[PDB]
């Protein structure tokens, strides 16, 4: 369904957001950043299958 071009563009978007977001600015924001990481990790598991 997904092409290598799409997988490769969605992964960076996620990593970029995880990297640049204000996820260390507060306890609340850390939880949100963690969810983003779980979303990023969930996606990797799939394209890795």
């Amino acid at each position: 369904q997904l092409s290598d071009e799409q997988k490769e563009t969605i992964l960076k978007a996620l990593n970029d957001a995880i990297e640049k977001g204000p996820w260390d600015k507060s306890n609340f924001l850390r939880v949100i950043g963690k969810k983003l990481i779980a979303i990023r990790d969930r996606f990797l598991k799939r394209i890795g299958a």
């Binding site: 369904q1 997904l2 092409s3 799409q6 997988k7 563009t9 969605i10 978007a13 996620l14 970029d16 957001a17 640049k20 977001g21 204000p22 996820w23 600015k25 507060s26 609340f28 924001l29 949100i32 969810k35 983003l36 979303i39 969930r42 996606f43 598991k45 799939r46 394209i47 299958a49």
Partner: protein, 58 residues
């Protein structure tokens, strides 16, 4: 599980990111005039828009 698909992207990325945006927006409505939550809304919005675009192939 299986490889990623459009349905997969929507249900496991786009939809959960939307939940994060709504949660952050809710935080903004409580307190207060902070620059951090605002930035999170922008970053998350850009993320979904980028993924939403990719999922549309263009």
């Amino acid at each position: 599980v299986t490889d990623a698909t459009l349905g997969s992207v929507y249900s496991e990325i786009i939809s959960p990111v939307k939940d994060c945006i709504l949660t952050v927006a809710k935080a903004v409505s409580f307190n207060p005039g902070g620059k951090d939550n605002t930035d999170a809304v922008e970053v998350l919005t850009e993320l979904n828009t980028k993924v939403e675009r990719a999922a549309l192939n263009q």
